[PDB]
Amino acid sequence: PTPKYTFTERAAAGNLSDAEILNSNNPTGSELPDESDVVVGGAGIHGLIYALHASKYKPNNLKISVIEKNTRPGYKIGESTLPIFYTWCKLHGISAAYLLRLFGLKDGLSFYFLDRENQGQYTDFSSVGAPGLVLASLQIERPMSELLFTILAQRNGVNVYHGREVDFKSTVVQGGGQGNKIAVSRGKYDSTPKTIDSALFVDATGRFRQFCSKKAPRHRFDGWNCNAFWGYFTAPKDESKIPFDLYEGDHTNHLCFPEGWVWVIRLPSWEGSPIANLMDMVTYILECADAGVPGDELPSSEELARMFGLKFQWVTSIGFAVRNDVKYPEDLSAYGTREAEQKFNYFVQKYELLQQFMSNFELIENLYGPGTTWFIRKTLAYQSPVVSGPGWLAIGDACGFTNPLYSPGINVGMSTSTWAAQLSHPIVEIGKSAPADAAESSIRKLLVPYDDYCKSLVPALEQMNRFNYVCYRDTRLGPQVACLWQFFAGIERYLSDVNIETFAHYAIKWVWGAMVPEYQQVAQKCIEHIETVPLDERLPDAMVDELLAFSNRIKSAAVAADDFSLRWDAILRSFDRSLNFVEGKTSRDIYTRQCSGCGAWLQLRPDWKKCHSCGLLGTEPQTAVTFDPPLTAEEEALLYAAWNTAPKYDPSKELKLPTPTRPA
Ligand SMILES: Cc1cc2nc3c(=O)[nH]c(=O)nc-3n(C[C@H](O)[C@H](O)[C@H](O)COP(=O)(O)OP(=O)(O)OC[C@H]3O[C@@H](n4cnc5c(N)ncnc54)[C@H](O)[C@@H]3O)c2cc1C
Numbered sequence: 145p146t147p148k149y150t151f152t153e154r155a156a157a158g159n160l161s162d163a164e165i166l167n168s169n170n171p172t173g174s175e176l177p178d179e180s181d182v183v184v185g186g187a188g189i190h191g192l193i194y195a196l197h198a199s200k201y202k203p204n205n206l207k208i209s210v211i212e213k214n215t216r217p218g219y220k221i222g223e224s225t226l227p228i229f230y231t232w233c234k235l236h237g238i239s240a241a242y243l244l245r246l247f248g249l250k251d252g253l254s255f256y257f258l259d260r261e262n263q264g265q266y267t268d269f270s271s272v273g274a275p276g277l278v279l280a281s282l283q284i285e286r287p288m289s290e291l292l293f294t295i296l297a298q299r300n301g302v303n304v305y306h307g308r309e310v311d312f313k314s315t316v317v318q319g320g321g322q323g324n325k326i327a328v329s330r331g332k333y334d335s336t337p338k339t340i341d342s343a344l345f346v347d348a349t350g351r352f353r354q355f356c357s358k359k360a361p362r363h364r365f366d367g368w369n370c371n372a373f374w375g376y377f378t379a380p381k382d383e384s385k386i387p388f389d390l391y392e393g394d395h396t397n398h399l400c401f402p403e404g405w406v407w408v409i410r411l412p413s414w415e416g417s418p419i420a421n422l423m424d425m426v427t428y429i430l431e432c433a434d435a436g437v438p439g440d441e442l443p444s445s446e447e448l449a450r451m452f453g454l455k456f457q458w459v460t461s462i463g464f465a466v467r468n469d470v471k472y473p474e475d476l477s478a479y480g481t482r483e484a485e486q487k488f489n490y491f492v493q494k495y496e497l498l499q500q501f502m503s504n505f506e507l508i509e510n511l512y513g514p515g516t517t518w519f520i521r522k523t524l525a526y527q528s529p530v531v532s533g534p535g536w537l538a539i540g541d542a543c544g545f546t547n548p549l550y551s552p553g554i555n556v557g558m559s560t561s562t563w564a565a566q567l568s569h570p571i572v573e574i575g576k577s578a579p580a581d582a583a584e585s586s587i588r589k590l591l592v593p594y595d596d597y598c599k600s601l602v603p604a605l606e607q608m609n610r611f612n613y614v615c616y617r618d619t620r621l622g623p624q625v626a627c628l629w630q631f632f633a634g635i636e637r638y639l640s641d642v643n644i645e646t647f648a649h650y651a652i653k654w655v656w657g658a659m660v661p662e663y664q665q666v667a668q669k670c671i672e673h674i675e676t677v678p679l680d681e682r683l684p685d686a687m688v689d690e691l692l693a694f695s696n697r698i699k700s701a702a703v704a705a706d707d708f709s710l711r712w713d714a715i716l717r718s719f720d721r722s723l724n725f726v727e728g729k730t731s732r733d734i735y736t737r738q739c740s741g742c743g744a745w746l747q748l749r750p751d752w753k754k755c756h757s758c759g760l761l762g763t764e765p766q767t768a769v770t771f772d773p774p775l776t777a778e779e780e781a782l783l784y785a786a787w788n789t790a791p792k793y794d795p796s797k798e799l800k801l802p803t804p805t806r807p808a
């Protein structure tokens with residue numbers, strides 16, 4: 145496919161604003177429709193996931209308009225995604241060769257637990273991702289992911305309007321047929337507001353809860369909450385002076401300690417690029433995905449930037465997520481002039497390993513515009529008590545949220561998004577096919593499981609977060625209890641069986657394993673003990689012993705019960721095939737390698753001989769994954785065979801669950 149510069153030239157020809165060039169790609173037009181089946185408030189990642197899944201699940205059934213107040217896809221924190229997300233992307237027709245042009249490769253998760261009372265001592269827990277011929281995970285710049293999903297939605301009969309705001313004072317939401325009158329303005333100042341007559345409103349306004357806040361007060365969990373402060377830094381080509389052994393930039397890295405933890409996410413940034421040019425680049429990529437262009441014949445990220453007149457750089461996202469019962473000195477003016485900056489630099493110097501780590505990185509000023517060198521957000525976790533009602537439902541952050549740790553926000557939160565997408569077809573048809581009272585009663589009944597799932601989901605995620613935090617207070621509990629149980633309970637068993645039809649059902653059964661009983665039992669034992677030790681104290685060694693022995697005793701039984709075959713000793717660097725801790729074990733599979741030219745992390749797979757980021761050829765060797773323990777030629781062939789194409793929808797297969805097998 146020859147590249148076209150349609151939007152770049154349209155924008156220039158008409159001096160189009162950012163919002164106007166984007167909205168000109170809508171099937172129905174750049175202006176709003178008079179009516180629609182579904183109106184989605186907010187085009188963050190979840191609003192777009194919802195609209196894409198709803199149209200893909202049953203094409204040509206619902207008219208869907210997404211209203212987004214930003215003039216173009218705006219900055220968002222929340223950059224790390226997991227295999228279920230990539231699988232969703234692949235099921236929507238975008239595989240790894242194309243996604244990697246836009247996003248950074250993610251090969252698993254890694255944890256380093258810093259001893260507070262013995263500065264310099266640390267332990268680690270490291271896992272891998274998957275071979276390049278299996279799947280990938282992604283580190284995504286959210287203005288790019290939300291552009292990608294805007295264009296893809298527009299190419300699948302979904303209208304998305306940037307630069308338009310839902311007016312929640314004049315909007316009417318009712319439960320009788322198409323009782324909704326959604327008021328859409330360009331802002332408070334707008335004299336000319338429009339109304340979209342519609343059947344169903346979806347509140348996807350994230351943490352702002354713009355609609356469902358009118359139905360219930362925000363709810364907070366007992367005990368401490370968290371704050372976060374973060375910034376953006378260079379990404380070093382040479383990672384070898386990072387002060388942690390065997391550190392790899394293509395993991396989502398977690399630096400953990402009693403007060404909380406630090407995330408480290410390497411990802412490419414497109415900031416500085418005109419929006420019309422990016423529309424042309426994304427559109428070209430989708431046409432190449434449509435055509436099935438092989439990876440080596442697809443232009444590299446940097447080449448795309450040259451072709452479409454874009455800006456491209458490598459950056460590292462680095463942030464603290466700490467408890468809000470931490471004591472700070474009254475005067476922090478020595479560490480900067482903004483609170484976010486102050487508390488960031490103050491926390492770094494409290495840990496020599498953090499200061500040594502941070503000394504590998506250079507701060508970027510105002511990557512996302514003025515005022516964005518530093519970010520702070522306080523009191524992270526919350527839940528919406530009411531997430532549906534006559535004429536409306538909520539998805540994503542608007543339902544609740546906990547913490548960045550293990551990235552439940554996108555990857556678990558998309559269970560609500562995709563389930564709501566699937567449910568939307570009968571909800572709209574019910575209202576079109578029955579009188580008002582019975583329709584409303586049948587819709588209420590249909591949504592009871594969605595309400596119950598949401599109700600119980602956030603508290604389970606909150607207990608998961610506290611479980612990990614309290615264990616982060618000791619360099620044995622962190623890797624050997626918290627991380628071990630999260631990975632055993634939450635690994636995505638039978639993900640290769642998921643398809644568009646089963647995705648929502650599978651996703652709502654995952655919950656990162658936080659519903660698994662033996663998980664919750666160990667989590668409660670640890671929280672009940674550690675929460676009684678004041679934060680500024682070290683856990684007594686006897687408490688660690690007792691919790692470690694308890695965790696391992698529950699573990700051996702739960703592991704035996706699991707009927708899922710898994711080369712555990714190849715996935716977790718510190719553990720054997722039965723998930724026993726092994727003090728000196730370092731053997732593990734190797735799926736990735738760093739480009740000698742640009743520093744970007746690459747997947748090893750024989751049909752990708754060039755860097756997908758800069759286009760430089762590696763030697764014809766390499767590119768061979770290292771399986772340790774080894775795999776035969778046949779065993780490796782059978783592995784990639786299962787992950788090629790997703791199974792067609794079989795209405796009689798039962799769904800196999802991601803969680804471990806129950807005991808007899
Ligand atoms: C510090 C931190 C780190 C995190 N890290 C991760 C991570 O690594 N991985 C992960 O998966 N998750 C992470 N999360 C969670 C993640 O950021 C969110 O779960 C995710 O962005 C939710 O997206 P959303 O679509 O629900 O809402 P958002 O992305 O917030 O989008 C809401 C949209 O609604 C729009 N809007 C609001 N009001 C109106 C109106 N009246 N009319 C029209 N539009 C409107 C806004 O413009 C906005 O675009 C993190 C969160 C925090 C705080």
Ligand SMILES: CC1(C)c2[nH]c3ccccc3c2C[C@@]23CN4CCC[C@]4(C[C@@H]12)C(=O)N3
Pocket residue numbers: 227252271272273274275278279631634635636637639715
């Ligand atoms: C299930 C999977 C997505 C996964 N989910 C994790 C969660 C936490 C830590 C590690 C993982 C992994 C690594 C896995 C294990 N599977 C072996 C056969 C195919 C696959 C898929 C992949 C693989 O190649 N690597």
Ligand SMILES: CC1(C)c2[nH]c3ccccc3c2C[C@@]23CN4CCC[C@]4(C[C@@H]12)C(=O)N3
Pocket residue numbers: 648649652795796797798799
């Ligand atoms: C298990 C089931 C009750 C179920 N539980 C859900 C939870 C959330 C979202 C959807 C579902 C469904 C729909 C299912 C999926 N199963 C496929 C084989 C038989 C069955 C039973 C039924 C079916 O026909 N429809």
Ligand SMILES: [Cl-]
Pocket residue numbers: 224225253396549550551
């Ligand atoms: Cl993660």
Ligand SMILES: [Zn+2]
Pocket residue numbers: 739740741742743744755756757758759760
């Ligand atoms: Zn390169």
